[PDB]
PDB file of all heavy atoms in Angstrom:
ATOM      1  N   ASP D  20      30.818 -69.673  72.299  1.00 45.95           N
ATOM      2  CA  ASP D  20      29.753 -68.758  71.874  1.00 45.95           C
ATOM      3  C   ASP D  20      29.413 -67.847  73.020  1.00 45.95           C
ATOM      4  O   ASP D  20      29.148 -68.263  74.145  1.00 45.95           O
ATOM      5  CB  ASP D  20      28.537 -69.545  71.355  1.00 45.95           C
ATOM      6  CG  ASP D  20      28.120 -70.620  72.300  1.00 45.95           C
ATOM      7  OD1 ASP D  20      28.946 -71.066  73.183  1.00 45.95           O
ATOM      8  OD2 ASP D  20      26.883 -71.018  72.233  1.00 45.95           O
ATOM      9  N   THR D  21      29.368 -66.505  72.768  1.00 47.29           N
ATOM     10  CA  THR D  21      28.940 -65.545  73.778  1.00 47.29           C
ATOM     11  C   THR D  21      27.497 -65.505  74.099  1.00 47.29           C
ATOM     12  O   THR D  21      27.143 -65.045  75.190  1.00 47.29           O
ATOM     13  CB  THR D  21      29.361 -64.123  73.223  1.00 47.29           C
ATOM     14  OG1 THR D  21      28.619 -63.789  72.182  1.00 47.29           O
ATOM     15  CG2 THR D  21      30.807 -64.089  72.970  1.00 47.29           C
ATOM     16  N   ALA D  22      26.601 -66.051  73.242  1.00 47.27           N
ATOM     17  CA  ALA D  22      25.194 -66.078  73.631  1.00 47.27           C
ATOM     18  C   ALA D  22      24.867 -67.023  74.859  1.00 47.27           C
ATOM     19  O   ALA D  22      24.174 -66.615  75.705  1.00 47.27           O
ATOM     20  CB  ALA D  22      24.420 -66.572  72.430  1.00 47.27           C
ATOM     21  N   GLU D  23      25.502 -68.165  74.873  1.00 46.64           N
ATOM     22  CA  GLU D  23      25.299 -69.062  76.081  1.00 46.64           C
ATOM     23  C   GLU D  23      25.832 -68.387  77.334  1.00 46.64           C
ATOM     24  O   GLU D  23      25.174 -68.546  78.356  1.00 46.64           O
ATOM     25  CB  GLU D  23      25.978 -70.439  75.770  1.00 46.64           C
ATOM     26  CG  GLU D  23      25.901 -71.341  76.975  1.00 46.64           C
ATOM     27  CD  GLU D  23      24.684 -72.245  77.016  1.00 46.64           C
ATOM     28  OE1 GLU D  23      24.150 -72.505  75.957  1.00 46.64           O
ATOM     29  OE2 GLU D  23      24.338 -72.586  78.024  1.00 46.64           O
ATOM     30  N   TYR D  24      27.075 -67.806  77.230  1.00 46.87           N
ATOM     31  CA  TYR D  24      27.565 -67.050  78.373  1.00 46.87           C
ATOM     32  C   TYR D  24      26.639 -65.956  78.802  1.00 46.87           C
ATOM     33  O   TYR D  24      26.473 -65.731  80.050  1.00 46.87           O
ATOM     34  CB  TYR D  24      28.947 -66.505  77.987  1.00 46.87           C
ATOM     35  CG  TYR D  24      29.525 -65.780  79.175  1.00 46.87           C
ATOM     36  CD1 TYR D  24      30.178 -66.441  80.311  1.00 46.87           C
ATOM     37  CD2 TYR D  24      29.663 -64.452  79.205  1.00 46.87           C
ATOM     38  CE1 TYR D  24      30.720 -65.735  81.335  1.00 46.87           C
ATOM     39  CE2 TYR D  24      30.253 -63.684  80.184  1.00 46.87           C
ATOM     40  CZ  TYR D  24      30.783 -64.430  81.268  1.00 46.87           C
ATOM     41  OH  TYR D  24      31.385 -63.643  82.331  1.00 46.87           O
ATOM     42  N   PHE D  25      26.074 -65.130  77.873  1.00 48.19           N
ATOM     43  CA  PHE D  25      25.137 -64.122  78.215  1.00 48.19           C
ATOM     44  C   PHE D  25      23.905 -64.681  78.996  1.00 48.19           C
ATOM     45  O   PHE D  25      23.453 -64.027  79.956  1.00 48.19           O
ATOM     46  CB  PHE D  25      24.803 -63.354  76.953  1.00 48.19           C
ATOM     47  CG  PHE D  25      23.936 -62.170  77.233  1.00 48.19           C
ATOM     48  CD1 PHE D  25      24.388 -61.122  78.087  1.00 48.19           C
ATOM     49  CD2 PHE D  25      22.722 -62.046  76.669  1.00 48.19           C
ATOM     50  CE1 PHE D  25      23.621 -59.939  78.313  1.00 48.19           C
ATOM     51  CE2 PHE D  25      21.849 -60.894  77.024  1.00 48.19           C
ATOM     52  CZ  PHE D  25      22.413 -59.886  77.789  1.00 48.19           C
ATOM     53  N   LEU D  26      23.373 -65.739  78.412  1.00 50.64           N
ATOM     54  CA  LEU D  26      22.170 -66.338  79.011  1.00 50.64           C
ATOM     55  C   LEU D  26      22.480 -66.810  80.398  1.00 50.64           C
ATOM     56  O   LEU D  26      21.639 -66.662  81.320  1.00 50.64           O
ATOM     57  CB  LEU D  26      21.599 -67.439  78.115  1.00 50.64           C
ATOM     58  CG  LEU D  26      20.545 -68.320  78.765  1.00 50.64           C
ATOM     59  CD1 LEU D  26      19.209 -67.624  78.865  1.00 50.64           C
ATOM     60  CD2 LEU D  26      20.384 -69.645  77.970  1.00 50.64           C
ATOM     61  N   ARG D  27      23.645 -67.483  80.555  1.00 51.37           N
ATOM     62  CA  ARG D  27      24.003 -68.012  81.884  1.00 51.37           C
ATOM     63  C   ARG D  27      24.233 -66.907  82.902  1.00 51.37           C
ATOM     64  O   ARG D  27      23.846 -67.027  83.990  1.00 51.37           O
ATOM     65  CB  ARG D  27      25.259 -68.872  81.790  1.00 51.37           C
ATOM     66  CG  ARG D  27      24.960 -70.391  81.689  1.00 51.37           C
ATOM     67  CD  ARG D  27      26.153 -71.196  81.563  1.00 51.37           C
ATOM     68  NE  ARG D  27      26.025 -72.386  80.736  1.00 51.37           N
ATOM     69  CZ  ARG D  27      25.442 -73.500  81.024  1.00 51.37           C
ATOM     70  NH1 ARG D  27      24.913 -73.599  82.290  1.00 51.37           N
ATOM     71  NH2 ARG D  27      25.339 -74.459  80.170  1.00 51.37           N
ATOM     72  N   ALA D  28      24.871 -65.801  82.462  1.00 50.55           N
ATOM     73  CA  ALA D  28      25.039 -64.651  83.317  1.00 50.55           C
ATOM     74  C   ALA D  28      23.727 -63.994  83.646  1.00 50.55           C
ATOM     75  O   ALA D  28      23.546 -63.606  84.898  1.00 50.55           O
ATOM     76  CB  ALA D  28      25.932 -63.646  82.744  1.00 50.55           C
ATOM     77  N   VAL D  29      22.784 -63.930  82.740  1.00 53.75           N
ATOM     78  CA  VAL D  29      21.561 -63.277  83.029  1.00 53.75           C
ATOM     79  C   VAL D  29      20.767 -64.224  84.047  1.00 53.75           C
ATOM     80  O   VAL D  29      20.116 -63.707  84.997  1.00 53.75           O
ATOM     81  CB  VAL D  29      20.735 -63.147  81.706  1.00 53.75           C
ATOM     82  CG1 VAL D  29      19.229 -63.001  82.039  1.00 53.75           C
ATOM     83  CG2 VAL D  29      21.283 -62.034  80.942  1.00 53.75           C
ATOM     84  N   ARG D  30      20.755 -65.525  83.917  1.00 52.17           N
ATOM     85  CA  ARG D  30      20.096 -66.408  84.873  1.00 52.17           C
ATOM     86  C   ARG D  30      20.801 -66.331  86.229  1.00 52.17           C
ATOM     87  O   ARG D  30      20.077 -66.137  87.283  1.00 52.17           O
ATOM     88  CB  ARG D  30      20.196 -67.772  84.358  1.00 52.17           C
ATOM     89  CG  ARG D  30      18.984 -68.657  84.877  1.00 52.17           C
ATOM     90  CD  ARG D  30      19.156 -69.013  86.323  1.00 52.17           C
ATOM     91  NE  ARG D  30      18.623 -70.306  86.675  1.00 52.17           N
ATOM     92  CZ  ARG D  30      18.205 -70.696  87.939  1.00 52.17           C
ATOM     93  NH1 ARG D  30      18.332 -69.862  88.899  1.00 52.17           N
ATOM     94  NH2 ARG D  30      17.698 -71.896  88.135  1.00 52.17           N
ATOM     95  N   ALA D  31      22.159 -66.304  86.293  1.00 54.41           N
ATOM     96  CA  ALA D  31      22.784 -66.317  87.501  1.00 54.41           C
ATOM     97  C   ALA D  31      22.587 -65.007  88.372  1.00 54.41           C
ATOM     98  O   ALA D  31      22.424 -65.107  89.520  1.00 54.41           O
ATOM     99  CB  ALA D  31      24.331 -66.506  87.344  1.00 54.41           C
ATOM    100  N   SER D  32      22.531 -63.930  87.588  1.00 54.10           N
ATOM    101  CA  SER D  32      22.288 -62.610  88.296  1.00 54.10           C
ATOM    102  C   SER D  32      20.875 -62.562  88.871  1.00 54.10           C
ATOM    103  O   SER D  32      20.645 -61.853  89.833  1.00 54.10           O
ATOM    104  CB  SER D  32      22.564 -61.427  87.407  1.00 54.10           C
ATOM    105  OG  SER D  32      21.609 -61.359  86.321  1.00 54.10           O
ATOM    106  N   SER D  33      19.968 -63.271  88.222  1.00 53.48           N
ATOM    107  CA  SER D  33      18.525 -63.235  88.620  1.00 53.48           C
ATOM    108  C   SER D  33      18.048 -61.717  88.518  1.00 53.48           C
ATOM    109  O   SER D  33      17.339 -61.349  89.356  1.00 53.48           O
ATOM    110  CB  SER D  33      18.205 -63.806  89.996  1.00 53.48           C
ATOM    111  OG  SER D  33      18.239 -65.185  89.918  1.00 53.48           O
ATOM    112  N   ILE D  34      18.524 -61.027  87.444  1.00 53.04           N
ATOM    113  CA  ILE D  34      18.320 -59.668  87.411  1.00 53.04           C
ATOM    114  C   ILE D  34      16.814 -59.367  87.116  1.00 53.04           C
ATOM    115  O   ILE D  34      16.343 -58.311  87.591  1.00 53.04           O
ATOM    116  CB  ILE D  34      19.218 -59.037  86.348  1.00 53.04           C
ATOM    117  CG1 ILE D  34      19.094 -57.472  86.273  1.00 53.04           C
ATOM    118  CG2 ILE D  34      18.991 -59.631  85.014  1.00 53.04           C
ATOM    119  CD1 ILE D  34      20.276 -56.763  85.767  1.00 53.04           C
ATOM    120  N   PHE D  35      16.135 -60.199  86.394  1.00 48.57           N
ATOM    121  CA  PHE D  35      14.786 -59.858  85.918  1.00 48.57           C
ATOM    122  C   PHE D  35      13.755 -60.123  87.063  1.00 48.57           C
ATOM    123  O   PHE D  35      12.887 -59.270  87.291  1.00 48.57           O
ATOM    124  CB  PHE D  35      14.437 -60.634  84.700  1.00 48.57           C
ATOM    125  CG  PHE D  35      15.105 -60.130  83.436  1.00 48.57           C
ATOM    126  CD1 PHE D  35      16.089 -60.755  82.812  1.00 48.57           C
ATOM    127  CD2 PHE D  35      14.680 -58.899  82.996  1.00 48.57           C
ATOM    128  CE1 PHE D  35      16.699 -60.244  81.734  1.00 48.57           C
ATOM    129  CE2 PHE D  35      15.228 -58.342  81.839  1.00 48.57           C
ATOM    130  CZ  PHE D  35      16.292 -58.986  81.238  1.00 48.57           C
ATOM    131  N   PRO D  36      13.706 -61.177  87.767  1.00 51.60           N
ATOM    132  CA  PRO D  36      12.825 -61.378  88.931  1.00 51.60           C
ATOM    133  C   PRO D  36      13.105 -60.229  90.023  1.00 51.60           C
ATOM    134  O   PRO D  36      12.123 -59.747  90.556  1.00 51.60           O
ATOM    135  CB  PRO D  36      13.105 -62.793  89.527  1.00 51.60           C
ATOM    136  CG  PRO D  36      13.647 -63.460  88.342  1.00 51.60           C
ATOM    137  CD  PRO D  36      14.447 -62.496  87.541  1.00 51.60           C
ATOM    138  N   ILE D  37      14.337 -59.993  90.242  1.00 49.49           N
ATOM    139  CA  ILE D  37      14.661 -58.887  91.246  1.00 49.49           C
ATOM    140  C   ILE D  37      14.227 -57.525  90.734  1.00 49.49           C
ATOM    141  O   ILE D  37      13.803 -56.765  91.525  1.00 49.49           O
ATOM    142  CB  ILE D  37      16.214 -58.962  91.590  1.00 49.49           C
ATOM    143  CG1 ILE D  37      16.506 -60.230  92.362  1.00 49.49           C
ATOM    144  CG2 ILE D  37      16.521 -57.765  92.463  1.00 49.49           C
ATOM    145  CD1 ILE D  37      17.951 -60.485  92.541  1.00 49.49           C
ATOM    146  N   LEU D  38      14.425 -57.338  89.469  1.00 44.78           N
ATOM    147  CA  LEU D  38      13.924 -56.061  88.840  1.00 44.78           C
ATOM    148  C   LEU D  38      12.432 -55.970  88.951  1.00 44.78           C
ATOM    149  O   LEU D  38      11.862 -54.832  89.168  1.00 44.78           O
ATOM    150  CB  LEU D  38      14.351 -55.945  87.390  1.00 44.78           C
ATOM    151  CG  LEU D  38      14.126 -54.626  86.715  1.00 44.78           C
ATOM    152  CD1 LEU D  38      15.105 -53.598  87.163  1.00 44.78           C
ATOM    153  CD2 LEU D  38      14.241 -54.816  85.093  1.00 44.78           C
ATOM    154  N   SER D  39      11.715 -57.090  88.676  1.00 48.93           N
ATOM    155  CA  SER D  39      10.246 -57.096  88.882  1.00 48.93           C
ATOM    156  C   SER D  39       9.895 -56.709  90.387  1.00 48.93           C
ATOM    157  O   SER D  39       8.950 -55.957  90.654  1.00 48.93           O
ATOM    158  CB  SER D  39       9.700 -58.450  88.514  1.00 48.93           C
ATOM    159  OG  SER D  39       8.271 -58.432  88.616  1.00 48.93           O
ATOM    160  N   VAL D  40      10.638 -57.264  91.368  1.00 48.91           N
ATOM    161  CA  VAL D  40      10.394 -56.913  92.767  1.00 48.91           C
ATOM    162  C   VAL D  40      10.588 -55.456  92.995  1.00 48.91           C
ATOM    163  O   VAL D  40       9.780 -54.744  93.607  1.00 48.91           O
ATOM    164  CB  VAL D  40      11.231 -57.869  93.649  1.00 48.91           C
ATOM    165  CG1 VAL D  40      11.182 -57.244  95.092  1.00 48.91           C
ATOM    166  CG2 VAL D  40      10.858 -59.261  93.588  1.00 48.91           C
ATOM    167  N   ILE D  41      11.659 -54.920  92.485  1.00 51.48           N
ATOM    168  CA  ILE D  41      11.960 -53.529  92.592  1.00 51.48           C
ATOM    169  C   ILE D  41      10.923 -52.711  91.961  1.00 51.48           C
ATOM    170  O   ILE D  41      10.466 -51.602  92.635  1.00 51.48           O
ATOM    171  CB  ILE D  41      13.356 -53.146  92.071  1.00 51.48           C
ATOM    172  CG1 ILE D  41      14.469 -53.803  92.899  1.00 51.48           C
ATOM    173  CG2 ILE D  41      13.582 -51.625  91.947  1.00 51.48           C
ATOM    174  CD1 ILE D  41      15.868 -53.777  92.311  1.00 51.48           C
ATOM    175  N   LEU D  42      10.489 -52.896  90.791  1.00 52.04           N
ATOM    176  CA  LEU D  42       9.443 -52.215  90.132  1.00 52.04           C
ATOM    177  C   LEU D  42       8.120 -52.218  90.898  1.00 52.04           C
ATOM    178  O   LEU D  42       7.411 -51.259  90.930  1.00 52.04           O
ATOM    179  CB  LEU D  42       9.310 -52.630  88.696  1.00 52.04           C
ATOM    180  CG  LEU D  42      10.436 -52.279  87.742  1.00 52.04           C
ATOM    181  CD1 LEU D  42      10.299 -52.897  86.443  1.00 52.04           C
ATOM    182  CD2 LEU D  42      10.604 -50.829  87.634  1.00 52.04           C
ATOM    183  N   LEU D  43       7.829 -53.367  91.435  1.00 55.66           N
ATOM    184  CA  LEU D  43       6.622 -53.546  92.279  1.00 55.66           C
ATOM    185  C   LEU D  43       6.711 -52.611  93.480  1.00 55.66           C
ATOM    186  O   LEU D  43       5.787 -52.019  93.879  1.00 55.66           O
ATOM    187  CB  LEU D  43       6.434 -55.042  92.688  1.00 55.66           C
ATOM    188  CG  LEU D  43       5.738 -55.951  91.621  1.00 55.66           C
ATOM    189  CD1 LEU D  43       5.689 -57.334  92.144  1.00 55.66           C
ATOM    190  CD2 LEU D  43       4.304 -55.445  91.303  1.00 55.66           C
ATOM    191  N   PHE D  44       7.869 -52.609  94.087  1.00 51.70           N
ATOM    192  CA  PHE D  44       8.034 -51.766  95.265  1.00 51.70           C
ATOM    193  C   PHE D  44       7.965 -50.280  94.929  1.00 51.70           C
ATOM    194  O   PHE D  44       7.329 -49.473  95.657  1.00 51.70           O
ATOM    195  CB  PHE D  44       9.455 -51.938  95.923  1.00 51.70           C
ATOM    196  CG  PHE D  44       9.582 -51.427  97.306  1.00 51.70           C
ATOM    197  CD1 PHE D  44       9.040 -52.072  98.394  1.00 51.70           C
ATOM    198  CD2 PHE D  44      10.166 -50.182  97.508  1.00 51.70           C
ATOM    199  CE1 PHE D  44       9.159 -51.547  99.672  1.00 51.70           C
ATOM    200  CE2 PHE D  44      10.374 -49.681  98.788  1.00 51.70           C
ATOM    201  CZ  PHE D  44       9.792 -50.386  99.856  1.00 51.70           C
ATOM    202  N   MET D  45       8.491 -49.873  93.732  1.00 53.58           N
ATOM    203  CA  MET D  45       8.370 -48.478  93.271  1.00 53.58           C
ATOM    204  C   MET D  45       6.915 -48.168  92.962  1.00 53.58           C
ATOM    205  O   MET D  45       6.392 -47.005  93.191  1.00 53.58           O
ATOM    206  CB  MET D  45       9.181 -48.183  92.110  1.00 53.58           C
ATOM    207  CG  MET D  45      10.667 -48.650  92.289  1.00 53.58           C
ATOM    208  SD  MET D  45      11.853 -47.511  91.595  1.00 53.58           S
ATOM    209  CE  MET D  45      11.305 -45.923  92.185  1.00 53.58           C
ATOM    210  N   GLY D  46       6.173 -49.132  92.357  1.00 57.04           N
ATOM    211  CA  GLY D  46       4.716 -48.896  92.269  1.00 57.04           C
ATOM    212  C   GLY D  46       3.960 -48.706  93.471  1.00 57.04           C
ATOM    213  O   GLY D  46       3.094 -47.821  93.551  1.00 57.04           O
ATOM    214  N   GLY D  47       4.240 -49.549  94.497  1.00 55.05           N
ATOM    215  CA  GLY D  47       3.550 -49.341  95.745  1.00 55.05           C
ATOM    216  C   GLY D  47       3.919 -48.030  96.403  1.00 55.05           C
ATOM    217  O   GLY D  47       3.114 -47.333  96.993  1.00 55.05           O
ATOM    218  N   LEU D  48       5.148 -47.607  96.301  1.00 52.38           N
ATOM    219  CA  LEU D  48       5.671 -46.341  96.831  1.00 52.38           C
ATOM    220  C   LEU D  48       4.889 -45.165  96.063  1.00 52.38           C
ATOM    221  O   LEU D  48       4.547 -44.172  96.722  1.00 52.38           O
ATOM    222  CB  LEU D  48       7.146 -46.184  96.668  1.00 52.38           C
ATOM    223  CG  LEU D  48       7.877 -44.857  96.779  1.00 52.38           C
ATOM    224  CD1 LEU D  48       9.276 -44.963  97.359  1.00 52.38           C
ATOM    225  CD2 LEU D  48       7.970 -44.102  95.413  1.00 52.38           C
ATOM    226  N   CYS D  49       4.753 -45.274  94.767  1.00 52.57           N
ATOM    227  CA  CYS D  49       4.010 -44.315  94.014  1.00 52.57           C
ATOM    228  C   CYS D  49       2.582 -44.215  94.444  1.00 52.57           C
ATOM    229  O   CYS D  49       1.997 -43.091  94.551  1.00 52.57           O
ATOM    230  CB  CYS D  49       4.165 -44.519  92.453  1.00 52.57           C
ATOM    231  SG  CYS D  49       5.597 -43.779  91.710  1.00 52.57           S
ATOM    232  N   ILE D  50       1.937 -45.391  94.684  1.00 52.68           N
ATOM    233  CA  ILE D  50       0.522 -45.392  95.182  1.00 52.68           C
ATOM    234  C   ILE D  50       0.529 -44.708  96.552  1.00 52.68           C
ATOM    235  O   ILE D  50      -0.401 -43.912  96.744  1.00 52.68           O
ATOM    236  CB  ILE D  50       0.066 -46.847  95.267  1.00 52.68           C
ATOM    237  CG1 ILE D  50      -0.286 -47.375  93.856  1.00 52.68           C
ATOM    238  CG2 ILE D  50      -1.114 -46.926  96.123  1.00 52.68           C
ATOM    239  CD1 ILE D  50      -1.401 -46.588  93.221  1.00 52.68           C
ATOM    240  N   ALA D  51       1.427 -44.994  97.402  1.00 47.33           N
ATOM    241  CA  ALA D  51       1.388 -44.312  98.711  1.00 47.33           C
ATOM    242  C   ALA D  51       1.554 -42.800  98.660  1.00 47.33           C
ATOM    243  O   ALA D  51       0.945 -42.091  99.323  1.00 47.33           O
ATOM    244  CB  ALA D  51       2.446 -45.003  99.612  1.00 47.33           C
ATOM    245  N   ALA D  52       2.494 -42.427  97.772  1.00 47.36           N
ATOM    246  CA  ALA D  52       2.742 -41.016  97.591  1.00 47.36           C
ATOM    247  C   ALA D  52       1.554 -40.270  97.023  1.00 47.36           C
ATOM    248  O   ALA D  52       1.253 -39.194  97.435  1.00 47.36           O
ATOM    249  CB  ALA D  52       3.997 -40.706  96.812  1.00 47.36           C
ATOM    250  N   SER D  53       0.884 -40.923  96.032  1.00 49.75           N
ATOM    251  CA  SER D  53      -0.331 -40.337  95.441  1.00 49.75           C
ATOM    252  C   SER D  53      -1.361 -40.286  96.487  1.00 49.75           C
ATOM    253  O   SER D  53      -2.166 -39.228  96.492  1.00 49.75           O
ATOM    254  CB  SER D  53      -0.783 -41.253  94.239  1.00 49.75           C
ATOM    255  OG  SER D  53      -1.691 -42.237  94.735  1.00 49.75           O
ATOM    256  N   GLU D  54      -1.568 -41.244  97.337  1.00 49.62           N
ATOM    257  CA  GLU D  54      -2.545 -41.235  98.376  1.00 49.62           C
ATOM    258  C   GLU D  54      -2.320 -40.077  99.394  1.00 49.62           C
ATOM    259  O   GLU D  54      -3.288 -39.664 100.111  1.00 49.62           O
ATOM    260  CB  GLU D  54      -2.635 -42.586  99.150  1.00 49.62           C
ATOM    261  CG  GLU D  54      -3.987 -43.023  99.507  1.00 49.62           C
ATOM    262  CD  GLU D  54      -4.591 -42.365 100.700  1.00 49.62           C
ATOM    263  OE1 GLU D  54      -3.792 -42.081 101.706  1.00 49.62           O
ATOM    264  OE2 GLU D  54      -5.785 -42.135 100.799  1.00 49.62           O
ATOM    265  N   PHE D  55      -1.131 -39.551  99.405  1.00 50.30           N
ATOM    266  CA  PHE D  55      -0.836 -38.364 100.336  1.00 50.30           C
ATOM    267  C   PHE D  55      -0.974 -37.000  99.613  1.00 50.30           C
ATOM    268  O   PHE D  55      -1.616 -36.085 100.192  1.00 50.30           O
ATOM    269  CB  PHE D  55       0.623 -38.586 100.824  1.00 50.30           C
ATOM    270  CG  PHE D  55       0.661 -39.179 102.231  1.00 50.30           C
ATOM    271  CD1 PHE D  55      -0.443 -39.956 102.700  1.00 50.30           C
ATOM    272  CD2 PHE D  55       1.799 -39.103 103.006  1.00 50.30           C
ATOM    273  CE1 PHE D  55      -0.343 -40.598 103.922  1.00 50.30           C
ATOM    274  CE2 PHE D  55       1.872 -39.732 104.210  1.00 50.30           C
ATOM    275  CZ  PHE D  55       0.732 -40.452 104.708  1.00 50.30           C
ATOM    276  N   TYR D  56      -0.380 -36.856  98.474  1.00 51.44           N
ATOM    277  CA  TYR D  56      -0.364 -35.621  97.742  1.00 51.44           C
ATOM    278  C   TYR D  56      -1.727 -35.202  97.288  1.00 51.44           C
ATOM    279  O   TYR D  56      -2.235 -34.055  97.569  1.00 51.44           O
ATOM    280  CB  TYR D  56       0.577 -35.660  96.580  1.00 51.44           C
ATOM    281  CG  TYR D  56       1.949 -35.175  96.846  1.00 51.44           C
ATOM    282  CD1 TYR D  56       3.012 -36.079  96.881  1.00 51.44           C
ATOM    283  CD2 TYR D  56       2.268 -33.837  97.114  1.00 51.44           C
ATOM    284  CE1 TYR D  56       4.267 -35.689  97.249  1.00 51.44           C
ATOM    285  CE2 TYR D  56       3.534 -33.442  97.386  1.00 51.44           C
ATOM    286  CZ  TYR D  56       4.582 -34.345  97.431  1.00 51.44           C
ATOM    287  OH  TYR D  56       5.825 -33.985  97.774  1.00 51.44           O
ATOM    288  N   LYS D  57      -2.453 -36.147  96.646  1.00 50.82           N
ATOM    289  CA  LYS D  57      -3.877 -36.021  96.199  1.00 50.82           C
ATOM    290  C   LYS D  57      -4.027 -34.837  95.148  1.00 50.82           C
ATOM    291  O   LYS D  57      -5.169 -34.531  94.809  1.00 50.82           O
ATOM    292  CB  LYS D  57      -4.841 -35.798  97.366  1.00 50.82           C
ATOM    293  CG  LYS D  57      -5.043 -36.988  98.248  1.00 50.82           C
ATOM    294  CD  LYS D  57      -5.952 -36.656  99.421  1.00 50.82           C
ATOM    295  CE  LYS D  57      -5.320 -37.181 100.694  1.00 50.82           C
ATOM    296  NZ  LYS D  57      -6.151 -38.141 101.398  1.00 50.82           N
ATOM    297  N   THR D  58      -2.947 -34.311  94.666  1.00 49.34           N
ATOM    298  CA  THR D  58      -3.020 -33.279  93.673  1.00 49.34           C
ATOM    299  C   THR D  58      -2.135 -33.517  92.427  1.00 49.34           C
ATOM    300  O   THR D  58      -2.626 -33.115  91.269  1.00 49.34           O
ATOM    301  CB  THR D  58      -2.539 -31.922  94.292  1.00 49.34           C
ATOM    302  OG1 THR D  58      -2.564 -30.885  93.348  1.00 49.34           O
ATOM    303  CG2 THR D  58      -1.171 -31.970  94.898  1.00 49.34           C
ATOM    304  N   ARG D  59      -1.018 -34.176  92.570  1.00 50.32           N
ATOM    305  CA  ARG D  59      -0.160 -34.544  91.297  1.00 50.32           C
ATOM    306  C   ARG D  59      -0.746 -35.903  90.809  1.00 50.32           C
ATOM    307  O   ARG D  59      -0.679 -36.932  91.472  1.00 50.32           O
ATOM    308  CB  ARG D  59       1.273 -34.651  91.795  1.00 50.32           C
ATOM    309  N   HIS D  60      -1.336 -35.783  89.638  1.00 48.13           N
ATOM    310  CA  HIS D  60      -1.992 -37.011  89.004  1.00 48.13           C
ATOM    311  C   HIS D  60      -0.988 -37.862  88.290  1.00 48.13           C
ATOM    312  O   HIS D  60      -1.311 -39.047  88.079  1.00 48.13           O
ATOM    313  CB  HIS D  60      -3.027 -36.552  88.038  1.00 48.13           C
ATOM    314  CG  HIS D  60      -4.255 -35.884  88.680  1.00 48.13           C
ATOM    315  ND1 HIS D  60      -4.630 -36.171  90.039  1.00 48.13           N
ATOM    316  CD2 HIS D  60      -5.107 -35.024  88.278  1.00 48.13           C
ATOM    317  CE1 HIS D  60      -5.648 -35.469  90.299  1.00 48.13           C
ATOM    318  NE2 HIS D  60      -5.969 -34.699  89.294  1.00 48.13           N
ATOM    319  N   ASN D  61       0.257 -37.395  88.046  1.00 50.72           N
ATOM    320  CA  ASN D  61       1.279 -38.181  87.359  1.00 50.72           C
ATOM    321  C   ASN D  61       1.789 -39.331  88.211  1.00 50.72           C
ATOM    322  O   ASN D  61       2.443 -40.186  87.604  1.00 50.72           O
ATOM    323  CB  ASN D  61       2.353 -37.267  86.857  1.00 50.72           C
ATOM    324  CG  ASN D  61       2.118 -36.748  85.490  1.00 50.72           C
ATOM    325  OD1 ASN D  61       1.195 -37.122  84.837  1.00 50.72           O
ATOM    326  ND2 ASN D  61       2.969 -35.834  84.993  1.00 50.72           N
TER     327      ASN D  61
END
């Protein structure tokens, strides 16, 4: 069954915790950039 293989690959890659780390880093970078520009609200 391909579902078990997909789940095992997803776990082995650890793609979601690492993606969470990456998104947290990009959020921090956006906060730092906003603290500098002070004009672009997006």
Side-chain angles (χ1 to χ4, degrees), residues 20-58 60-61:
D20 48 338
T21 66
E23 174 91 28
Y24 179 76
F25 185 62
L26 170 73
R27 261 180 219 282
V29 162
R30 209 286 212 203
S32 71
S33 282
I34 185 156
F35 284 109
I37 294 169
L38 188 73
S39 187
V40 168
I41 291 172
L42 290 173
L43 281 175
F44 196 79
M45 313 216 48
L48 163 151
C49 270
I50 283 296
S53 88
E54 222 278 325
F55 266 16
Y56 270 108
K57 288 175 231 237
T58 178
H60 294 331
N61 271 351

